[PDB]
Design a protein around this ligand. Structure first.
Ligand SMILES: [Cu+2]
Ligand SMILES: [Cu+2]
Ligand SMILES: [Cu+2]
Ligand SMILES: [Cu+2]
Ligand SMILES: [Cu+2]
Ligand SMILES: [Cu+2]
Ligand SMILES: [Cu+2]
Ligand SMILES: [Cu+2]
Lengths: 85, 85
């Protein structure tokens, strides 16, 4: 019922819907690509929520590292999907 | 219904349950920790599935990078969880 828990669930919903679409890919490489994008966007969403509501400095710093790390992997992946269909 | 799609859904099923459990945490820092563990286990399962069915060399290499990189990162999360309440 809290705002942080409400924000975690909204991020999960978005990740879940995109994850199901990825499982619906017959090409396993396209499923992996689609899947990992939804995974990375979910981790950015969890980390942004942790940076907004979390109070532990160890978790807060881990969340910042995650936001930076998950962007470079989405980059190459979007290209692979855009150059295959 | 394909074997690869069925193995992707099995990992998604696993990640979704633990993700929902993480969202149900009232402590937003514990939700983040549980959430990221569920993300790491979900990314490993996708990559293991990609290593078994995938044919593209780039994704398979990306999936191997995931298994190697995401192995040490769960450790620090369980350590944080096991020393907090
Ligand atoms: Cu909920
Ligand atoms: Cu569902
Ligand atoms: Cu579904
Ligand atoms: Cu997935
Ligand atoms: Cu299914
Ligand atoms: Cu559900
Ligand atoms: Cu639920
Ligand atoms: Cu999550």
């Amino acid at each position: 019922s809290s705002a942080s828990s409400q924000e975690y669930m909204a991020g999960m919903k978005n990740m879940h819907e995109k994850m199901m679409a990825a499982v619906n890919e017959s090409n396993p490489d396209k499923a992996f690509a689609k899947g990992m994008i939804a995974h990375h966007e979910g981790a950015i969403a969890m980390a942004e929520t942790e940076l907004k509501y979390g109070k532990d400095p160890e978790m807060r710093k881990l969340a910042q590292d995650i936001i930076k790390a998950q962007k470079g992997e989405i980059e190459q992946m979007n290209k692979w999907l855009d150059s295959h269909k």
